[PDB]
Amino acid sequence: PSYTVTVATGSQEHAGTDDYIYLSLVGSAGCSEKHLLDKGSFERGAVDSYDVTVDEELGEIQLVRIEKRKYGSNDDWYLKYITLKTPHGDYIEFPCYRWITGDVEVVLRDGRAKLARDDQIHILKQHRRKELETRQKQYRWMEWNPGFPLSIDAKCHKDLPRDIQFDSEKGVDFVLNYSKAMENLFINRFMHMFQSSWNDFADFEKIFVKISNTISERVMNHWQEDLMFGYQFLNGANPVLIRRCTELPEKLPVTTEMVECSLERQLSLEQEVQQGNIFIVDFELLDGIDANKTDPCTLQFLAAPICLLYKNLANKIVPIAIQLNQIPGDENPIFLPSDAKYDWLLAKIWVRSSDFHVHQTITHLLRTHLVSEVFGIAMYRQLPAVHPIFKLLVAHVRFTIAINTKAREQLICECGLFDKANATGGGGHVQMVQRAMKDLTYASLCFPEAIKARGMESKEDIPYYFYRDDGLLVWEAIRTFTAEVVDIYYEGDQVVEEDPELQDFVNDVYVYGMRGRKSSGFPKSVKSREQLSEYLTVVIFTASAQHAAVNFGQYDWASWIPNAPPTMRAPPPTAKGVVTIEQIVDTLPDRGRSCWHLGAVWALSQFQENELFLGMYPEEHFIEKPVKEAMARFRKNLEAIVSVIAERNENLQLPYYYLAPDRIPNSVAI
Ligand SMILES: [Fe+2]
């Protein structure tokens, strides 16, 4: 006449509670009494089980109610799951993975994923509708800054619902992690020297040689070469800007007689464009952006350079022309590799600095962080936990809302940590998000479509694009995985369309997240399994693979300041033959900003000791068999990719491992 109720406490630091825990089973034939549990503490990592006897036949168990009542001071409890062993020998499981504060009573369905059309009885429908009601009351949309994608309604981290907070209050913390990173890097004494320029490169080299890793040391030695400059646009930390030219821009008055020395095929520059040997990186987005004026004693400067690139006979991409500003003229020279050494070097440094600003604000912040947060909030608002898509996506939006809220509390807010080192600080980066937001499309988030639209899709013409190669693989694995999860729970396209909560989810992304602008190209609705599989792939790939590629290479390529400076303390050169090495040094970031730069890119490039990489789903929201085997196959494909990439890296001078599935986190956690 008894049930065996098993309760599992989380492994997180504060997962334990000393408060009262009541439990009541809700069955079809009736509900059970409230049973007090333990009368003691539920320690972290611990699993408790009780023999509970019921006074009347409950029939098939539908819901489990858990109730936390206070004892002493409040103590947050993290319930992982609950399993029942019924008198009829049935084993039922209830996935939770939620923080339980004394304010509310938590009610859980069984693990089996359910669409709304599957629930016909009052008890299940009541729960489902009330769950969404509480969701939409806790998770609300907000416009943090004009023209931004909508984000969560919270000023700071602690205001967030306990469920979507970090497991610790200061577990991740920009203020704390940065100063801690600057101590690990032995540069803590330099944190306040914004008026002190490095004496020469050797002065910074003395500091850098201690904290350099493999790639960065390679960067220290080879940053001045043309081959490395062009290399980063394909395999660097921000390889999303380069595109193949179909014609020379009229704002770039470059001639064959200027670049004839770099041309190696006896063709004119115009004819080289016809062969598709010419590539281009345009920073028009940076034009008009306000420079950092938050420091009255330091003048910081920006540029909007146009860089002309060329694929030589060795199939390597190298710079042949660099114009630092958008509108051509006598004071906006076109710098060439045939100019004096420091002229062509300083021109390069500026393009590198420009690449860095677009990287952090557009590629990094907007196109991965903010986009994922949108998918995350829309998921919480419109998708109940029993829904299959919730179970699939929840592992990929982990800590996303939390890390963004932290960043808006400390990093990119007015007078935030971002303002110290960056030339886009002081509001400039806000202008960039706004302007880029206008051209952020749904197709641009679809990886194969994104690569083609830049004209980089050909493996044959452009064989050394590793970001593309590995990316296309990881994308194909996730597309295959989601197509299978969708095929399990959706009989056909008609079921996908008739799903009210899925459409509500898709609609919340279009209308609120993307501000309901028609030019974004996001689906207003999803009416087929094929489309749903692509949509889910966009969500997962962005939060995992795409974010990994553009985040964890920050210390590799940017720890050597002259290769990716956060700010320039002198305006772009308007004339040739003038620039000296002493002036490049005084233009480059000071000691204070170099150190807040070094600390930042180091801290953002770290993996957690408990980091969950792609395919790792420790928390079991899905408990059904067909989806387990789906998840299984997905892990096999990923492990097949890690091998493919591993072999390829053996034949490279500088391996590309950012998109290797064992280094790709599940979500945006940093
Ligand atoms: Fe990030």
Curated annotation (Swiss-Prot):
Membrane topology designation: Peripheral membrane protein
Catalytic activity: (5Z,8Z,11Z,14Z)-eicosatetraenoate + O2 = leukotriene A4 + H2O; 18-HEPE + O2 = (5S)-hydroperoxy-18-hydroxy-(7E,9E,11Z,14Z,16E)-eicosapentaenoate; (18R)-hydroxy-(5Z,8Z,11Z,14Z,16E)-eicosapentaenoate + O2 = (5S)-hydroperoxy-(18R)-hydroxy-(6E,8Z,11Z,14Z,16E)-eicosapentaenoate; (18S)-hydroxy-(5Z,8Z,11Z,14Z,16E)-eicosapentaenoate + O2 = (5S)-hydroperoxy-(18S)-hydroxy-(6E,8Z,11Z,14Z,16E)-eicosapentaenoate
UniProt keyword annotation of Manganese present: no
All residue ranges annotated as the PLAT domain in the record: 1-114
Cofactor note: Binds 1 Fe cation per subunit.
Alphabetic keyword roster: Calcium, Cytoplasm, Dioxygenase, Hydrolase, Iron, Leukotriene biosynthesis, Lipid metabolism, Membrane, Metal-binding, Nucleus, Oxidoreductase, Phosphoprotein
Modified residues (Phosphoserine): 268, 520
Documented effect of changing residue 573 to L: Does not affect arachidonate 5-lipoxygenase activity
Consequence of changing residue 600 to I: Loss of (5S)-lipoxygenase activity. Loss of (5S)-lipoxygenase activity. Does not catalyze oxygenation of arachodonic acid to 5-HETE
Gene Ontology biological-process annotations: arachidonate metabolic process; dendritic cell migration; glucose homeostasis; humoral immune response; leukocyte chemotaxis involved in inflammatory response; leukocyte migration involved in inflammatory response; leukotriene A4 biosynthetic process; leukotriene biosynthetic process
A GO cellular component entry from the record: cytosol
Residues binding Ca(2+) 1: 16, 75-76
Binding site for Fe cation: 364, 369, 547, 551, 670
Regulation (activators, inhibitors): Undergoes a sequential loss of the oxygenase and pseudoperoxidase activities which is dependent on the structural characteristics of the substrate for the reaction, on oxygen concentration and on exposure to phospholipids and calcium. 15-HETE and other 15-mono-hydroxyeicosanoids exhibit the highest inhibitory potencies in their capability of suppressing 5-lipoxygenation of arachidonic acid, whereas the other HETEs, (5S,15S)-dihydroxy-(6E,8Z,11Z,13E)-eicosatetraenoic acid (5,15-diHETE) as well as octadecanoids, are modest or poor inhibitors.
Coiled coil: none
Post-translational modification: Serine phosphorylation by MAPKAPK2 is stimulated by arachidonic acid. Phosphorylation on Ser-520 by PKA has an inhibitory effect. Phosphorylation on Ser-268 prevents export from the nucleus. Phosphorylation at Ser-520 is stimulated by 8-bromo-3',5'-cyclic AMP or prostaglandin E2.
Pathway(s) this gene product operates in, as recorded in its UniProt entry: Lipid metabolism; leukotriene A4 biosynthesis
Cofactor section: Fe cation
Residues reported in the UniProt entry to bind Ca(2+) 2: 17-18, 40-41, 43
Essential for stabilizing binding to COTL1 (site feature) positions: 99
Family statement drawn from the similarity comment of this UniProt entry: Belongs to the lipoxygenase family.
PANTHER family: LIPOXYGENASE (PTHR11771)
Subunit architecture: Homodimer. Interacts with ALOX5AP and LTC4S. Interacts with COTL1, the interaction is required for stability and efficient catalytic activity. Interacts with PIK3R1; this interaction bridges ALOX5 with CD40 after CD40 ligation in B cells and leads to the production of reactive oxygen species (ROS). Interacts (via PLAT domain) with DICER1 (via Dicer dsRNA-binding fold domain); this interaction enhances arachidonate 5-lipoxygenase activity and modifies the miRNA precursor processing activity of DICER1.
Protein name as it appears in the record: Polyunsaturated fatty acid 5-lipoxygenase
Originating species: Homo sapiens
Designated gene of the protein: ALOX5
